[PDB]
Swiss-Prot record:
Protein's job: Transmembrane metalloprotease which mediates the ectodomain shedding of a myriad of transmembrane proteins including adhesion proteins, growth factor precursors and cytokines important for inflammation and immunity. Cleaves the membrane-bound precursor of TNF-alpha to its mature soluble form. Responsible for the proteolytical release of soluble JAM3 from endothelial cells surface.
GO cellular component annotations of the record: actin cytoskeleton; apical plasma membrane; cell surface; cytoplasm; cytosol; endoplasmic reticulum lumen; Golgi membrane; membrane
Protein name as it appears in the record: Disintegrin and metalloproteinase domain-containing protein 17
GO molecular function: cytokine binding; endopeptidase activity; integrin binding; interleukin-6 receptor binding; metal ion binding; metallodipeptidase activity; metalloendopeptidase activity; metalloendopeptidase activity involved in amyloid precursor protein catabolic process
Gene this chain is encoded by: ADAM17
Record's note on what induces expression: In arthritis-affected cartilage.
Tissue expression as described in the entry: Ubiquitously expressed. Expressed at highest levels in adult heart, placenta, skeletal muscle, pancreas, spleen, thymus, prostate, testes, ovary and small intestine, and in fetal brain, lung, liver and kidney. Expressed in natural killer cells (at protein level).
Full-protein positions shown: 218 to 474 of 824
Active site (UniProt): 187
Source species of the chain: Homo sapiens
Length: 255
């Protein structure tokens, strides 16, 4: 482990919805929430031994927090991840999650090329209980830690796949902080290279009396069970395949 290259620096973006609903129209409330959330997620990462031995101390730190206090004004037909209306259905509280991540990655491309990861924090009720999305760890899909260019034929420019998003709204209410911590952990988990834990591998998907599920389980975990705030051995194997190579590529020293 390289202590000079063990931290994935993050650009954290809070959109106007997150600012209004979670930050109560205040920057200090917005930033404190995000600073504490990343630090608790960092504790999970930093304490994980990816090889089940001494390969630990790998984590995350915020480089910058961008706070979008108001919606992004758009020209008719033009779209932006921070616009007032949801896309593609303006009548719905939320965007289609996949289109929102693509849009965020498009709009943040220049900034994203200079950071290990960009993560959007929003407050919108994604259809069917979805809480987040991220590139990487998907079973021709690519992305995750360290900017990787993708030429957008629609966008007509390179976008970077080092992105993810978390919503703190679900089924018409703010999720608990213990729940939000796990969304971000899961999404950054995909960014670090983990896929979802399968039911077919009991070691990676234990029963409730055996500590419950691990953070990469596809059905959301409310941190009440022992395993909820940990990575399965499946997640560790997947992340460990590339963690060191990615660390050499874009990770920095813990500030
Ligand atoms: C933190 C969780 C693990 C993230 C995943 C989404 C995901 O895998 N993105 O990486 C999620 O939102 N899962 C939902 C989920 O488990 N939501 C819970 C909160 C829920 O709404 N359950 C309601 C039962 N119908 C799905 C899409 C499975 C409904
Ligand atoms: Zn997932």
């Amino acid at each position: 482990p390289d202590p000079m290259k063990n931290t994935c620096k993050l650009l954290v973006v809070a959109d106007h919805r997150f600012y209004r609903y979670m930050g109560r129209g205040e920057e200090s409330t917005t930033t404190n929430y995000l600073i504490e959330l990343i630090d608790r997620v960092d504790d999970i990462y930093r304490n994980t031994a990816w090889d089940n031995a001494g390969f630990k101390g790998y984590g995350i730190q915020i480089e910058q927090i961008r706070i979008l206090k108001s919606p992004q004004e758009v020209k008719p037909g033009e779209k932006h991840y921070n616009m007032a209306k949801s896309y593609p259905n303006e009548e719905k509280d939320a965007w289609d999650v996949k289109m929102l991540l693509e849009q965020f990655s498009f709009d943040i491309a220049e900034e994203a090329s200079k950071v290990c990861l960009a993560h959007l924090f929003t407050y919108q009720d994604f259809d069917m209980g979805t809480l987040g999305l991220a590139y990487g760890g998907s079973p021709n899909s690519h992305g995750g830690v360290c900017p990787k260019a993708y030429y957008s034929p629609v966008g007509k420019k390179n976008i970077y796949l080092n992105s993810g998003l978390t919503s703190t709204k679900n089924y018409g209410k703010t999720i608990l902080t213990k729940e939000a911590d796990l969304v971000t952990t899961h999404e950054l988990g995909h960014n670090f290279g983990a896929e979802h834990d399968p039911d077919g591998l009991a070691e990676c998907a234990p029963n409730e009396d055996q500590g419950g599920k691990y953070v990469m389980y596809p059905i959301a975990v409310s941190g009440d069970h022992e395993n909820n705030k940990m990575f399965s051995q499946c997640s560790k194997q997947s992340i460990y395949k590339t963690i060191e190579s990615k660390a050499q590529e874009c990770f920095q020293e813990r500030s």
